[PDB]
C-alpha cells in the first residue's frame, strides 16, 4: 500500500504548519497578557495601591493569568499535555 506512507508524510506536514502558526499567535496572546501585568504594575501599582487599593493586583492576576489560559486553550491538547509534568 503505497498510499499509507503518502498519508503519513502529508500528516507530518500539516502538523508542522499547524504548530508554527499556533506559536506565533499564542505568543501574541501571552505578550498581551504580560502586557496587562506590566502596564498595570507600572501604572496601577505605584505606592498609592498600598494605602488600600488592591485593584492593581487583580489586573495582574487577570492579565497575568489571561495569557496562560490563552496559550493552553489556543494550544492543541497533545501539545499542552506534553508540556505538563
From TrEMBL:
The chain crosses the membrane at residues 24-50, 56-75. It is found in: Host cell membrane; Host cytoplasm, Host perinuclear region; Host endoplasmic reticulum membrane; Host lipid droplet. RNA-dependent RNA polymerase that performs primer-template recognition and RNA synthesis during viral replication. Initiates RNA transcription/replication at a flavin adenine dinucleotide (FAD), resulting in a 5'- FAD cap on viral RNAs. In this way, recognition of viral 5' RNA by host pattern recognition receptors can be bypassed, thereby evading activation of antiviral pathways. Ion channel protein that acts as a viroporin and plays an essential role in the assembly, envelopment and secretion of viral particles. Regulates the host cell secretory pathway, which induces the intracellular retention of viral glycoproteins and favors assembly of viral particles. Creates a pore in acidic organelles and releases Ca(2+) and H(+) in the cytoplasm of infected cells, leading to a productive viral infection. High levels of cytoplasmic Ca(2+) may trigger membrane trafficking and transport of viral ER-associated proteins to viroplasms, sites of viral genome replication. Belongs to the hepacivirus polyprotein family. Forms a heterodimer with envelope glycoprotein E1. Interacts with host CD81 and SCARB1 receptors; these interactions play a role in viral entry into host cell. Interacts with host EIF2AK2/PKR; this interaction inhibits EIF2AK2 and probably allows the virus to evade the innate immune response. Interacts with host CD209/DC-SIGN and CLEC4M/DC-SIGNR. Interact with host SPCS1; this interaction is essential for viral particle assembly. Interacts with protease NS2. The heterodimer E1/E2 interacts with host CLDN1; this interaction plays a role in viral entry into host cell. Homohexamer. Homoheptamer. Interacts with protease NS2. This is Genome polyprotein. It comes from Hepacivirus hominis.
